[PDB]
Structure formats: C-alpha cells, structure tokens
Design a protein around this nucleic acid. Structure first.
Ligand SMILES: [Zn+2]
Lengths: 82, 24, 149, 88, 101, 65
RNA sequence: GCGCAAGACGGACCAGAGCGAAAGCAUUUGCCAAGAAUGUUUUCAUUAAUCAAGAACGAAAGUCGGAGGUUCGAAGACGAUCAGAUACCGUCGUAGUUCCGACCAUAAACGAUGCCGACCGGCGAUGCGGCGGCGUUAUUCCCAUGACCCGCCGGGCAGCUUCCGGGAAACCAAAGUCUUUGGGUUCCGGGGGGAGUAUGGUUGCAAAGCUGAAACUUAAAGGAAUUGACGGAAGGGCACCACC
C-alpha cells in the first residue's frame, strides 16, 4: 500500500464495501419484475419487500418477507429492471 | 490490618455516643 | 450511538445519487397522490404508506415523484392526525408497559424501561412544543395517557 | 406379583441405562437435549419416559464445536415428546 | 503490580460467575478460576486385572471405567503438584502439557 | 577441517548434470486457473501443456481443537 | 431393600461462550410486557452530547413484622493440639441461610482505566444478522429449508503479532495521535501522618450512611525495574572427611 489510489477504486473494490462506506453511497437493492405462473399480469416488486405481495385480482401470493431479500414462491420468475 | 483498626475506631464512636449525649 | 442503549449499530438506508424517477415507472404525480389519499383512509401512517407503495407500486420515493412529502400531502388534504406518529407510538408503548406493571409489582426492570420511555416522550414533546405543533399547555399525564391513545 | 409353588412371577417395573454408558456419552463440545413425557397405556399403566440425545459432528467439519441454537432444541424436544407419546 | 492479563481467570464480558466447591477443601472458587480435571480411570488397576478375568463368567467381558470431574482451588492444585510455577515467559504458554504423546 | 583435495572431490561431485534435464518434459500438467494466467501472458499456443481436473471438495484446512 | 414427607438446590453438558445500565442471569412448558444487532430506494427532519438540583435500581451482611424451618452455620457449650489457644482440627448448635411486606445504600461494587466523536498496522478464530459460491448430508427426486464446506459486509466478547507511537518502567493498538502542547463535556488529586477522627448539619427503628476540620507531628513515605541474601516454594547434580 502507502500509495493506494483513493480517487479511482476498481469496481471489484467498491462492490465489496459497505454501502455507506463507498466513495459515493449506493443501495444494494433493486426493483424486480415478477410474473405469476397462472396469471398474466406483470408486477413490480421490491427486492427487500416487507409486505406479502399478491396479485390484485388473480389472488396469488407473489412473495413472502424474510430477514433479507423477500422470498419468491415457486413457479414465479423475475428479472431486474434496468 | 486496616480493617481491624476501622472496626476498633467504630466501637469507640459507638461508646462515645452513650458517654457524650445531649443530656450531659 | 443509541440514545438509551449502549449499542452503536450502523444499519440504515442509502439513497441513490439519482434523484430522478426511472423511465419504467409511468405513474403520474396526481395518480401517486390518489393512492396516498386512498391508503390514508384505511388508518395507515405515512411510514406505512411509504412501505406499501415501495413494495407494491414501484414507488421508491414520493419526494422524487410528486416533489412533496407524504405528511405534507396528507396535511394539505386534511388527513393528518392530531398527534405526530412518532409521539403517538411512544405513548402507546408507555401505556402497554404501565398496564403490565399493575399485575407485576416485582418487575423491577419494566420500571426502568418505563422511565426511559417517558424520558423519550418528554424529549419529543419539548421538541414539538418549540415547533408550535403541540399547544404550549400540552403535558403528558401518566394516568390520562390512554385518552391520547 | 405372585408365588406359584416355589416360583415367583414378575412383571415389568422400569428401565434405565448404565452410569458408565451415560458418562461415556456426555462429552464437552456438543449439545445435550432431553425430554420427559407422562403417558398412560391402553391397559391402564401410567409411565414417565425420559429421552436424551446429543449433537453430532460432520465428516468434513473443521470447527471445534457443534452447538445447536435454542429454537433448534425446542423443535427437537417437541419431536421427542410426540414420538414417545404415540408409541405408548 | 499486575501479573496476568486475564487476572488469573476466564471471565470476559460478564459480571458474576457462580461459585463451586473445591474437591479437597470444600472452598468456594469461581468456576472460571478453578482448576478442572476430567479423570477417566479403570475400576480395577493393572494389579488386579489378571485376578478378575480368570474369575469372570463372561468371555470377552470389557471392564467398565470411572468418570470424575475434579475442581481445585489455586492452593490445592499447587500443593498436590497438579500445577507448577514457571518462568515469566513460560507463563504465557497455554498449550496443554504433552501427555498425549 | 578443510582439505583442498576434498574440495576438488566435492567439486567433481557438484559438476554433475544428467544428459536429460529434469525440466524438459514432453507434457506439463497445468491447472485450469494457471492456464488463464498463461492466456493473459499471451502463452496460449504452448503445446506441451495439459489442463487437468481440479479437486472438487474445498477441504484444505486442519480441524480445530 | 420397598415406600412416605419436608425444605433447600438446578450437577455433568458449561466455553477466555451469550444477555443486562450495573448489581446480576442456567430444569420443562405456557402467558405478559421489554430489548440489542442486522435488513430497508419507509417515515419525522436537528428533534443532539455531558450533566448542579432531583430521581429509579443497587451483592453480601444487618433491622422490623408474618410463614417455614432440609442443609450449612456467627454466638455459645464441649473434645483435641499447644509452653499458653479465648484460634486453626473435630461434635453439637442459636441468630441467620429460604419465602412474603417494609427499611438499610454499602464492597478489591475492579478492566483498580467516566461518557460521546474522528484518525492511525497486520493475522487467524468466535457469537449474531445479512449476501454470494463448487461440492457432501436430511437416503435415493421438485424447489425452498436445515447440518457441514469456502469467502464478503456490519455490530459484539476476546486472542496472537509489530521499532505505529507512547511510558519511570511494568506495559498499552490504546494508556497512541502531548513543549510540533486546544474535538465536546462531567467528576475528582496536590509530601507522609493526625484522619475520614472531632464538631455542626442531614437521613435512618437501630446499626450506621452522606458532608467533613484544625491544633500538633514529620524528611521522607511511595511506584517500577536490577544484582544479591533468604524461603517450613518447585526442579536437577556431586562426594566413603555422605549414605548404601
Ligand atoms: Zn482446595
């Protein structure tokens, strides 16, 4: 060390740090776009959702809250938004 | 030992309570 | 660190640099406010409304969408309550700790926690009275508190 | 219970392990889990059954200790308590 | 002056530790300060095994053992030569004595 | 002691090299991770190499206690 | 040996492990309220740090009334040892030790080290929460879920190492960032005794707690480390002026 470049840390260095301790703060969460296996509507869900998210009319549970990221039910797929 | 001397100095005070009162 | 605890935890939220609404969220400001009014009439506090919106409708921040905050929106429409939510939840906990304390007279530790809770209540009440949110004659009564809750 | 002409006839009265067995089983860096149930049999006998069990180390484990968390031993005790009841 | 960094104990991050009685004195010692030994011995010594198997009615009988946990105060572990004194630097060696060799 | 005749004898012992060295091998066994390092070293055209299967169980520590 | 009862106590698992503001906390199950840490693209928006007065809790012992009294056991009565023993050892044994309700506010209550905040070296572990990754196992499968394995992040109890720097040194990653002397704030010390004593005030049923001098006396008392001498401290070696 003793000559570490504090201005330009590598992407592998910054992704390993705590979110508040990075050079600029950034969340580790995202919005993911979930599809019910039976229903056709496509629903946006927070990665760390605290509420049991369910379809408005198709009456199907999409996820269950846990201590970290919410857990999707079996048969439901997703993909990160942008 | 200071513990014993502390005990000794307390008996003297307890007796002087009796031998030195407001009624004296 | 914590006010009434020796802890020094660091967990919190980290807002992104982007103050801008993403392109995939197509909800207009007026439609976002309509959900705020709708959920305000089901007895939801602003902090509950925020998590509901975040988890379901893709609304990360309403200050970023509508350019205002939830409590200000509710107060402008007239849906804000009498006591602020943080002071409301502190008085509710004081009644619960005090209600447990008549069936349990030898519970010496709830007696310590109640002192801490009421100290926190007094701190918030002082702050709000300096801000002209509570009337200057407002005072927290340990017996009458249930009337506020 | 009876003496039928120079022979005395016996019935089941209890059961237990040996002190040597128990003391050999009790080791340090693991966890002990115990339970007790009262169950009455169909024919009218009331019994109290005690059960013991110890946490096991894995084949590739590198750590020294194999302790179980408190809610993990309340589940195990709950399972000991129901299997002993149904089988008596 | 201070001799040991751990004050002769194992207490860290707690206030009170329940006491126990020395096996030899019946003296109250904190559990983290007492000198503890687990002894697994044989009931019969090697001076009696040859006279025990010849009288045993079971072929290949394995004789039982005896398990005792012993607690000592600092004074008895030294008098009974369970624990010795050692130099200032050697005091920092906390590896068990090479008995397992 | 030190005899210069013994020095000469030990130098004759030291001046020993086999006809075929130990470092010229027809095949050199190389891990998949070393192959990528050689790729970064523009040595992907080596013909004496043979990538091998690495060990699967990640058990390289001594048990504690 | 088979039963019955009484009160006390929760062994082994039990660890330089966990929780609590500190005293302190260990059999199962249920109820009641509480709490840290982690997770968070929730909410309020300076609401904060330390604190005269004033308050809550505070080991053990001790004091007042009720209940009960297994064990242990101040006092006391004995038996030994001894030159003497009013002790150490032994046999009994009162108050007490236990519970309920009021007092008492003291400990080597110690990390002998106030609290809040920033910066300053490494390494392996451990407890909790989260995140990722080959592969074993819950018997042969669906996924989650558990038990292992390899890492990363945050908050904890600690450990090893270092010419970071400090110190009288012992030693301390804090006891560092101090003549290159200022982040905020509370309490408290000024050679050794007299003396935490007298006196006044105050609290308490009492025992006592808190506050707290002076006259006089004295050239040292004291802290770290070093060579010896000695030890009714532990290990080795030698000698027919030692033994066998
Ligand atoms: Zn002893």
């Amino acid at each position: 060390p003793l000559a570490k470049d504090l201005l330009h840390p590598s992407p592998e260095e910054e992704k390993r740090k705590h979110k508040k301790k990075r050079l600029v703060q950034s969340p580790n969460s995202y919005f993911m776009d979930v599809k019910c296996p039976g229903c056709y509507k496509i629903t946006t869900v927070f990665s760390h959702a605290q509420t049991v998210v369910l379809c408005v009319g198709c009456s199907t549970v999409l996820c269950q809250p846990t201590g970290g990221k919410a857990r999707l039910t079996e048969g439901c797929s997703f993909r990160r938004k942008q | 030992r200071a513990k014993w001397r502390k005990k000794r100095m307390r008996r003297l005070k307890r007796k002087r309570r009796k031998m030195r009162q407001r009624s004296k | 660190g914590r006010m009434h605890a020796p802890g020094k935890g660091l967990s919190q939220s980290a807002l992104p640099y982007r103050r801008s609404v993403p392109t995939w969220l197509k909800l207009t400001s007026d439609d976002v406010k309509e959900q705020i009014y709708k959920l305000a009439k089901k007895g939801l506090t602003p902090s509950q409304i925020g998590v509901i919106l975040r988890d379901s409708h893709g609304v990360a921040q309403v200050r970023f969408v509508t350019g205002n905050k939830i409590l200000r929106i509710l107060k402008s429409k007239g849906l804000a309550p009498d006591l602020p939510e943080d002071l409301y939840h502190l008085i509710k906990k004081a009644v619960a700790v005090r209600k447990h304390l008549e069936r349990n007279r030898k519970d010496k530790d709830a007696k310590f926690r109640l002192i801490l809770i009421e100290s926190r209540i007094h701190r918030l009440a002082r702050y709000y009275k300096t801000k002209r949110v509570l009337p200057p004659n407002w005072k927290y009564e340990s017996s009458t508190a249930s009337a506020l809750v | 219970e009876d003496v039928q002409g120079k022979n005395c006839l016996t019935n089941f009265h209890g059961m237990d392990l040996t002190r040597d067995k128990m003391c050999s089983m009790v080791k340090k860096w693991q966890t002990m889990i115990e339970a007790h149930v009262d169950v009455k049999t169909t024919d009218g006998y009331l019994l109290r059954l005690f059960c013991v069990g110890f946490t096991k180390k894995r084949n590739n484990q590198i750590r020294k200790t194999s302790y179980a968390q408190h809610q993990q031993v309340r589940q195990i005790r709950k399972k000991m308590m129901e299997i002993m009841t149904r089988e008596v | 002056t201070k001799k040991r960094r751990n004050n002769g104990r194992a207490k860290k991050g707690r206030g009170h530790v329940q006491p126990i009685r020395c096996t030899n004195c019946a003296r109250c010692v904190p559990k983290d300060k007492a000198i503890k030994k687990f002894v697994i011995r044989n009931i019969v010594e090697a001076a009696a095994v040859r006279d025990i198997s010849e009288a045993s009615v079971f072929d290949a009988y394995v004789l039982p053992k005896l398990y005792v946990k012993l607690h000592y105060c600092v004074s008895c572990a030294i008098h009974s030569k369970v624990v010795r004194n050692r130099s200032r630097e050697a005091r920092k060696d906390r590896t068990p004595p090479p008995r397992f060799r | 002691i030190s005899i210069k005749l013994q020095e000469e004898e030990r130098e004759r012992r030291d001046n020993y090299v086999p006809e075929v060295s130990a470092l010229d091998q027809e095949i050199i066994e190389v891990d998949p991770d070393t192959k990528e390092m050689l790729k970064l070293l523009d040595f992907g055209s080596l013909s004496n190499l043979q990538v091998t299967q690495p060990t699967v169980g990640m058990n390289f520590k001594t048990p504690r206690g």
